[PDB]
What we know:
2 chains, B: mainly beta, 23% strand, globular, RNA-binding, translation, mRNA modification, tRNA recognition, 50S ribosomal protein L2
Amino acid sequence: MKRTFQPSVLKRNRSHGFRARMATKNGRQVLARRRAKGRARLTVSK
Amino acid sequence: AVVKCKPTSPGRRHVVKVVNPELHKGKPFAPLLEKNSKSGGRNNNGRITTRHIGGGHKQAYRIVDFKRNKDGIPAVVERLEYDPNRSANIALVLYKDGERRYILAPKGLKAGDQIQSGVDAAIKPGNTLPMRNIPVGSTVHNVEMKPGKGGQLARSAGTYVQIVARDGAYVTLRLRSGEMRKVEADCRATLGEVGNAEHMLRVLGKAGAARWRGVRPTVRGTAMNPVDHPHGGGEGRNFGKHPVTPWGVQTKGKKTRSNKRTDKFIVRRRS
RNA sequence: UGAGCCUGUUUGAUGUUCUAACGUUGACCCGUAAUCCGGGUUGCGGACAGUGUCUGGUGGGUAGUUUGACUGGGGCGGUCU
RNA sequence: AAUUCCUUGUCGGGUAAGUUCCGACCUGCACGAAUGGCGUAAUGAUGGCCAGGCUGUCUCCACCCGAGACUCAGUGAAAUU
RNA sequence: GCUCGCCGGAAGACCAAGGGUUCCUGUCCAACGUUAAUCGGGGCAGGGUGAGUCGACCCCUAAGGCGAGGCCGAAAGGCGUAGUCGAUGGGAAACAGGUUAAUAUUCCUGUACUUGGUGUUACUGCGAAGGGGGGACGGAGAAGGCUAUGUUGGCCGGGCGACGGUUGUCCCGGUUUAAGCGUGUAGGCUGGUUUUCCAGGCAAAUCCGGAAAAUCAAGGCUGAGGCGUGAUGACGAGGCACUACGGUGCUGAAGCAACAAAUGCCCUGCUUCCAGGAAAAGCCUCUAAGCAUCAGGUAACAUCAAAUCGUACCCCAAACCGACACAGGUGGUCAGGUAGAGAAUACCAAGGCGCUUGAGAGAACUCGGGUGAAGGAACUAGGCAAAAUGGUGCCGUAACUUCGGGAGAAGGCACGCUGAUAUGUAGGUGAGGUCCCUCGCGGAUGGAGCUGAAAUCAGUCGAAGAUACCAGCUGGCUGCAACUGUUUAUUAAAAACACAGCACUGUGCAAACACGAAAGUGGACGUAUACGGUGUGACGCCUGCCCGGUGCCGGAAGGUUAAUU
RNA sequence: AGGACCGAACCGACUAAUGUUGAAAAAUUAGCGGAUGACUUGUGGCUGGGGGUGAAAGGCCAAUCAAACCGGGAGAUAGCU
């Protein structure tokens, strides 16, 4: 039975990547929020 | 020629075809082609703005001369041709100086004919003149609406327009809808009427035929629910209400024209 | 064309004509190496069209709510001073 | 009658026997002409009825071949209280 | 180590996507492995990935994303021009043999090819952000030439058989060789050359396009396969001496022909149909401003350069998606023998496995199968389930019909083996020999050898010759929707939805209509034989009366009526 | 020639039995429908919540849909247990 997750690095990076986040005003807010909380990993990029 | 097909299958029982043995078999002219892509009805926002469109066959665009400039140089007809972007055939012409062009095909035009455009051109089919030089009571096609713009009226298969009266700097025309209109006398037009009048005597035969051309199914509003259309609901089959569009306006009788900028060029409306 | 003033003087409404505000999703030149944009010349409409404030009409297309109590179970009947 | 409450209406066919099926009658509680009327060859993992062949579906059950259930050695849950 | 069973269009071999040391060697058995474990895809330590030609990076674009100035919006922001990105698509070049415990078109041996820079010699009009060619394109169908591959014969090396016979029409094994270079065949397409002139290709053209004379009839482009060279080489059963069980040095026979044959190549070809079938660069040509002693261009020699990242292993699965060492899901390539129409079905080859708890007994009852005396739907809401028919060739076949159908209607007869026709028949391929010739991968005649259906007559065995796996049950009367299609992922597949056809109504182009505070965009690079909305649903015969109510369309003389003064 | 006919690969889901603390949070075995077309599959792209897409079942939008998920107003209100 086909399930929901079907991996693809290209799509992953084009969807939730660092440059994608920085391209928009709200993505910078996501980054600032995570930085304030103090996370070890910011984005999905290796 | 209209030909019925034999009933060798249920999808072939009701098929009538139009066949013309004079159309060219082979590739088209290359220097006058362009690529055309499909849309599905979607606009620049990505939304369906016109319904029931999608799919079909790949097509290429043939450039056509609705201007008919180039006065004074005769041209000869080379071959007639098929066009997937319209309901009328096209013709290729070669000019005396070595330039080729595509034009609309009128009735009775065949290979080996001579055509011309200008103020002093003859009066015969396929020739172009400003409407200040055509006799009153003539049949024309490919009519302009502004001097120097391009043909915009009577461009489909079998159609034409009639000149009725001339008075001043204006000409009065009767259109295919039963309407009288006024346009400037410096516009252009072409003698005769458009060809391929057999186009309306065809029967498709099966749903795949309409799917080949890019038409998707139509769903009735009485088969939906009250949250989709003003015609939905019911325990059984019920209507009990005045017919309306999918957005709440009355079909079957109401009017929708509102244009005060152009009301002065209408003499009498379609009856 | 009906109305004041001292046939002569202002303000109204109806219609003909004009060009100078305004429109041009008609043609040509330049920025420019470009079917966006701006400038220039020339045709075509022209005080119409269109927009702002105010005002009468229509408006389940969309939104927020109302639709009482008694009762040998509730509803239908009947009642409530 | 995909519609008929009274109703298993009445007459004929098929069965030894037929509240279902087929053909008619008109007393249509409450059919009817593009929210279409009456027909129709071919097509349907569509609803109803009847025959030939075939059988453990059944009178009415008997034997046999394999995996569990039982005994021995190792590992080892659960709902509820 | 010797037997036995299972798969074999897979349960074999190689990849992509996705994981990331699971790969090889040494040592250990606490916890993990549904049991024991000396074993492991487990613990610890060391080793392993070698490129001018394979990929990525690079040159060019599709759908689409961003977007200098620009237009638009309370802010935030939206859409777009010149540009610049984005593969699932276009763009140079390499093959055999040997080798490690683990890498191979990368390492060693033998023989090849592709693009640029620099110097010399010889000939000389070169030049882009511009003009032209080319790249460059659909569905279906047919038969002609071939190869991969197989079968038999010939040749070389062994054997003479645990129990009757086996010196022969006997048994087992081998018979392999590439890219590059020359030859330009089966076949496909197109007439060649010179001179004059011209309102076209934003300007120029010797290039493209068009008109007019003369002459010549054979010029050019394309193209699988075969043949020679590569090759006095490599490989090859076995043999000459030693073994750590992975091996060293040497030596080495034959290495031919006939037949059948693809869904692969010629073939982006040929024939036919309507629904009419991508873009840009590399590449070939022509010139403009400009330089002409220069710079530059074509040809020959010598020299240099081709950097950086991936390369282990799994990959229909115990290593990926399902919490699990889970009976599920996952795209591409390769295609042996005997029967058979076949990539179906049965037994095998190369190769790979026996699925990580066992040993006994032979109770009721549950699950998956086999057989049944007499009867044959008497069972049940209902023939639910089971039983039954099942191939090829020939005879033969109703009502009704839109003349295509119904139809495989229904129902019957033959089917194995051996001999003769004919020591292998009708067909298919085809060497030698004789002539002709522009002398070649030629033409005509010729038949040695190889392969091989269907049929008739006459005999013979058994209860049964389509013998196993495989493989339609048939007929009569009715309701609904004309027909092929779609739908409630996870209790409803239908009479519901769609449909070809028909009618009403709107729309004159800056169209009606829709997404948008606006700019803009789709409708459409379309123009009433075209577009949007609503109802009915092939086809045949048809579709009657009512405008009082509510809608819609036209009128405008009378009554009522807003802001404003 | 054909939304033609029989039938493997490929795409579906009509009947029955098993399973229901399952081998599986929708499967297995024996039968079943389409199979040159309105067909089927790989890679990348676009449409965002009173919104989209819908051969129309209130179907689908990450095991969640008569108004998705996440964080805030927030200790919303609760004549009721």
